[PDB]
Write a protein that binds this ligand. Structure first.
Ligand SMILES: *C/C=C(C)/C=C/C=C(C)/C=C/C1=C(C)CCCC1(C)C
Length: 235
C-alpha cells in the first residue's frame, strides 16, 4: 500500500503471485458468472470475453516473459494489442449498439487507437525517449477521446437510450479514463524516479496497467450488465 523498494526476486515474486491469484480468481468468477449475466448480453460477454480473455492471457504471458529476461518480441504485444484493441472495441460496441443497429464508436476508437499504438510502437522501438513526453501525447489523445466520445451516437440512436446501455457505457468510459490515466501516473513514479531506474517497477506497473485494462474491463462491464439487467446486492 505504497512505498517502492524491493529486490529483484522480491518484487518479481510479489507481482507474479498477485497476478496468478488475481487472474485465477477473475477467471473462475467470470467463468462461473457467465451464466449469471443478462440474457441479451449473452453475445456481448461472448465476444467481449473471448477477445478480452485471449488478449489478457497473451499479453500477460508476453509481459511476464519480457521482464523475466529483459528482452522479448514486441511484435507480438504490438500486433496482439493492435488486434485486440479494434476487436474488443468493435465487438463490445457491436453487441452494445446491436440494441438499435450499430455503434460508430469503432471509427473514433480506430483513429485514436491507431495513433496511440503508432507512437508506442515507433518510440517504443528504440525506447530511447517517449516516457517523459508520453504524458503529453497521452493526455491530448485522452482528452480528445472522451471529448468526442461524450457526444457519441449512442444516445443519438433514439434519444435517451436505455438505462442499461447508459450504465454500461458510462462505467466503461469511467474505467477507461481512470486506468489509461493511471498508466502514466504510476509509470512516472518509476520512469524518472524510483531508485536509480529499476526495471522492476517498469514491468510491474506495465503488467498492472494491462491487467486492469483487461481484467477490470470485463469485471466492470459484467458487473454493470448483471447489476443493471437484474441482480441483487451481496458481496
Ligand atoms: C490490453 C491493453 C490495453 C487496453 C493497453 C492500453 C494502453 C494505453 C492506454 C497506452 C497509453 C500510453 C499513454 C497514455 C501515453 C503515450 C504512451 C502510451 C501509448 C504507451
Amino acid at each position: 500500500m505504497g512505498g517502492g523498494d524491493l529486490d529483484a526476486s522480491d518484487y518479481t515474486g510479489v507481482s507474479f503471485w498477485l497476478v496468478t491469484a488475481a487472474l485465477l480468481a477473475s477467471t473462475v468468477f467470470f467463468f462461473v458468472e457467465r451464466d449469471r449475466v443478462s440474457a441479451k448480453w449473452k453475445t456481448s460477454l461472448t465476444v467481449s470475453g473471448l477477445v478480452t480473455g485471449i488478449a489478457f492471457w497473451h499479453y500477460m504471458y508476453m509481459r511476464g516473459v519480457w521482464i523475466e529476461t529483459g528482452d522479448s518480441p514486441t511484435v507480438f504485444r504490438y500486433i496482439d494489442w493492435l488486434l485486440t484493441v479494434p476487436l474488443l472495441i468493435c465487438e463490445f460496441y457491436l453487441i452494445l449498439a446491436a440494441a438499435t443497429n450499430v455503434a460508430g464508436s469503432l471509427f473514433k476508437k480506430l483513429l485514436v487507437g491507431s495513433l496511440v499504438m503508432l507512437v508506442f510502437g515507433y518510440m517504443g522501438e528504440a525506447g530511447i525517449m517517449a516516457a517523459w513526453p508520453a504524458f503529453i501525447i497521452g493526455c491530448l489523445a485522452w482528452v480528445y477521446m472522451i471529448y468526442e466520445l461524450w457526444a457519441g451516437e449512442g444516445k443519438s440512436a433514439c434519444n435517451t437510450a436505455s438505462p442499461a446501455v447508459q450504465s454500461a457505457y458510462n462505467t466503461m468510459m469511467y474505467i477507461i479514463i481512470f486506468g489509461w490515466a493511471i498508466y502514466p501516473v504510476g509509470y512516472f513514479t518509476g520512469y524518472l524516479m524510483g531508485d536509480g531506474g529499476s526495471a522492476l517497477n517498469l514491468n510491474l506497473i506495465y503488467n498492472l496497467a494491462d491487467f486492469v485494462n483487461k481484467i477490470l474491463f470485463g469485471l466492470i462491464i459484467w458487473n454493470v450488465a448483471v447489476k443493471e439487467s437484474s441482480n441483487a446486492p451481496g458481496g
